[model samples]
Target chain A: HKLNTDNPIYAYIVGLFEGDGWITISKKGKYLLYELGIEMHIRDIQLLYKIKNILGIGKVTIKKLKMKDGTIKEMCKFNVRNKNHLKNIIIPIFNKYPMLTNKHYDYLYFKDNLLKDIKYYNDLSYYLRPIKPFNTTEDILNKNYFSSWLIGFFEAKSCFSIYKMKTASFEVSMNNNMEVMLAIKSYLKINNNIYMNEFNNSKMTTKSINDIKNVVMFINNNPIKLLGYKKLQYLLFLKDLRTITKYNNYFKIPSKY
Target chain B: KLNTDNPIYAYIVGLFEGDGWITISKKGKYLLYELGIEMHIRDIQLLYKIKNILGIGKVTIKKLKMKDGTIKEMCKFNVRNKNHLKNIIIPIFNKYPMLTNKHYDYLYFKDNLLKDIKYYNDLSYYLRPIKPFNTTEDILNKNYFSSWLIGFFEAKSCFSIYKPMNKKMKTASFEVSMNNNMEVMLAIKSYLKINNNIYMNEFNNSKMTTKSINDIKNVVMFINNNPIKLLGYKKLQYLLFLKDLRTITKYNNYFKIPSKY
Candidate 1:
């Protein structure tokens, strides 16, 4: 099914359900183990700190060691405890902000907020209400900010996945090159953010900033290009975040700066 | 607005009330004649014959001096002598076939007598059977049998009309092309003998054999090539057929042919 970009959170939730997980056979037969970790549940306040750390100076290397026969030799691992706590704190906040439940959160919320200041921005305006300014720079350091950012990023990522699924479905059904191109282009444009200055500024350390900058720049520069690569990167990031949030063991949050 | 193709005889009756009239209004006085011709009250046995004749080009053309123009030509004019007469009231007979015993009579006669009627008896064996080749042949003749001897040229004409309409409406609201082709081909191959030597031998002069083949072929080919022309010609043909069927059934007590059956 093609992802409906109208609701980005829905797209992201669909991606989370469809993309990540291990198959487990229980009394209920086969079931998917969606490894949602603790770090993912962290409050928006904590999420800001985590994003600042990971995107700032942390060397977050995600690698899967597979056998020559394509069997998994060693699984790629990430911080789980931090992720789970993030999820625990963030889920409630999201419940409060139902609009954030779907994928186009940043574009819908941030764009609308930006438009309030720059009234001339028409197409760039988010369909939803504006994002209110943080009370202070400390407010930027709050758990709510980080929670919202993660929610937004995941929503966009999931939306992109949905578009990919939709494009694939259409190609399978119609087998037309033009249709494939149109669906792909539409998906990419909906998810792509030409301006991600907030993401850049939030990184805590120089290395994390550079890493996040590279990823953001890649996204900004190649709206249509690297669709597959970016999709995989975001997918992995979401999976890692989920795993961290569920297990509550890996990835401790360094003390808030 | 009226679905002449379906079982909406009431609309046909309404049309008569609305359009079948002669109004005389002069200087603050108005006179509207209802035409008082009740085609909606006819028997179906008679209606079926009228429908068949009207459908298959059995019609009279009358030329009359027009009030506004030089001359006007009316085709297939079957005028009743009296507006209130029961027997000759064509519109009354035409409109009520579904509810009247006339339809039952026609159906009964078709079932029992058509098989015994020498000219049409053999047609029973041809009805409801699959003969793709016969269908293809029917399509060719309907388009080019009168004008040309080569079949593919005619087939191409049929295909050209069918293909585009099928494609355009493939994703849209209506999907009539494929379904219509199936019905038309089925009707022809099942109800008409394509290879019968007697019929084929006397094809040119035999109106039953010749016209049936041509009519069935034309309809089948038009429907088959719907994708090619975006369904424009097919829709036009359907609309015209519907209008004719409505008139015949409403005014002449005709047995309506099922679109598929």
Candidate 2:
């Protein structure tokens, strides 16, 4: 059976999968097996069970992972390797909600090789696939979606922290996504430079009180708001940015409550 | 000050949960009851926001040296007037009851402030321990399953591709990780009805990953169906995943290779 288009749970599942899911093809004997799976921490084993039920295919397996420090850890993997499952059930659902990362390109490579029955292309040849660039549109910028989308993205890529200046700073970063950074800069209406950090990721940060003010305004005034610990962080960050006085020490907060 | 029923107060309550405080100090023969929210210099606007929202409060800056002799500057949004706490600050928090242990702190602060104000005490009043707050029941169950779920997923998940030795085709998988939040993870698993196991590391961090077509389909449906969907680079990634899925479906139904002269 097909999932409802407006299913809220599926939307989160999509985000989860996009965050940490996989599709790979391997050869065992004469069969070219296309494997669909997700590996999760043991703490999230319940989620794995749910995904298995959703698809009605796949198995959960635990493997021993040896770390650099010589400690062995347990890893859980859920996978469906049957070709029929990929063709009839799995492929159709993703057609409903697409992904938001370059891994989509990887999905293309996986698909091209799996369904076409084409002769083998060399490993590096897969790199030749053209990556579709992410484009920003007026509709995306004008609607409340701009705020909603940015808030979600911000929760992922942004940081709310105390800088060396003892002032709260907010930044959103990504590796090699300069255009997105520039788009966000324009949308935010802040003049702060989008710079690069030691990690080589492009970053857009606000440190000045004025710029931080603009950021707070952008968040609070948005239609879709920040939800999670960041809301609390942003709140504290606002308190820090809006601090009305001067006391320098990390005073121990009383636990009287 | 805005009225008690305003939406802006909801936002204020969130900020208060992070840094707002109620404290009483002994100065000379009298007791001082203060309602304050302190933050770094950059966050001074929040103080101003609160001031403007309530229409009465002072924003003051004080520079104090730490024990290490380094200088630090801070801003405080303060309400020291007993009348304002009784008539304004107390009502605001009461309307938007806190979602953290801070809620309990507010209760204590309220009692002490009221007690001191009526009696103008010389005797010391000690605060009690905060009551336990079950964040999963209070916060996660109510809010985290929404768009923030995707945001956090975007932050912690990875859409992975792997190439094996001398293989013509590569494999792709999507996965999410977290340090620890078994409750949230369990809530999500139940929400999605996923029948997968979570992986754990030496440091107790947890993760979930899948490379199966069936699992990817479920994920795709969820992301597409949700009210608040993926945006930014993660959205781009989901689009690619969708594109890949479309191609797989197409190729499966109709075999094809573009012909060129």
Candidate 3:
């Protein structure tokens, strides 16, 4: 679809990109570089269909996951593949609003490669998923450069909607961004069995008492350095956590001088 | 060096407030004290403007590749010799006077810059930067020195608390920072009627990290003079820090103040 650059739709798309989309190049294979797309649950593909109408380009495709019970479950995905559509629409929209994530580097990588003209598999050395899905602090921090950047990447998209179950999930729809979440999960040191259903549909929750505690400690010590209300929200959460270290677990939050 | 009351003197203060730097770096056995303004390469005309006004120093261009795949171009107008600085730079700021905390920097920078042998020894200056003020009256283009300065710091500066996420800060550091805006800094100098220089890092030269304790107290007094209520967590932090000045330490407290998303 032809994007309305003047409206908030551009910012909305950029947010969806950070939340549930990708800007990737087929680094080793067909060499289709700079592909921007979003993935959704099969039930919610209607939203993408409407987005396709709003955006002017795109179609839905299904992934058939074969279960051991001999039943097949379908998951849907939406992508805008043509190079011209990417250059004309998705490229400019992001340039205006600019996705505040490491995904931005992918956009820059693709846009920069295209701007100078042509393609080559040998053009760049690194591929999209350089961060191996890790599960422990020591394993992840020493294993990847993405560790230094995860603080920023998650600060933009990771939700700290701390409620009844101590939630700490990224809002990336479907289970599409699960691997990225897994990389963070490994840092928080959650068990592999904790993946649960999907992120948006299911709570994709934590079972450990200090699972959220470790996440909080990591962010405060390392500094994700959020903006505005996000920083204030983090401070509010931190204010509750380190509250005199006296009595623990009170959500009512009494303020004392 | 003459103490001429030219408006350009104030312009230098504002530019310094925005994109100026005065520092003491190590050189063999001695300390090299330099005073300079590094504008964006696009604003080399400003470098030229400064050189033309000062009638000394040299101008050069520097280019860098920023993390976001963009180039950063800066025009550096500098005076290196301690004599030229002590003779030319010191005389200018002292007479016209400055409004921001960089005033403390120039004072501190100048005091350490004596006879090469004089200040070649004191090695205790470091940190990220200081804060600015705000006012109800039109401070900019309105030519209200203290009023404008109050307004300037309020919008551009910050006061921070350092701790184990919860400990009392000794004495708060009030610092301000501006990027790619040398003209407004010049305007600030003109209005304040002081030639206090803006500060920048020794290596990067794009951002400034300078402030003084005395200047912090003075600005705090100017702010509390009227019922001009500053906003948010900062307003409360300011009141407490004003009273508990000495308990603050030098760890450089900062809170990212971008508008809430």
* Docking class for candidate 3: incorrect
lDDT of 1 by residue, A105-149 (tens): 432343233324332333232354234422333332222222223
Best by TM-score: 2
Rank the candidate models, highest TM-score first.
2, 3, 1
Task: Report lDDT per candidate.
Answer: 0.27, 0.58, 0.53
Residue A176 lDDT, candidate 1, scale 0-100? 19
Worst 10 residues of 1 chain A by lDDT: A165-174
DockQ of each: 0.00, 0.02, 0.01
Query: What is the lDDT, from 0 to 100, of the residue B194 in candidate 3?
Result: 33
List TM-scores for all candidates, in order.
Answer: 0.16, 0.37, 0.30
DockQ of 1: 0.00
Interface RMSD of 1: 30.5
Top candidate (DockQ): 2
Cα error of candidate 3 at position B107, Å:
8.8
The alpha-carbon RMSD over the true interface for every model, in angstroms, is: 30.5, 18.1, 23.2
Give the CA lDDT, 0 to 100, for residue B91 in model 2.
Answer: 77
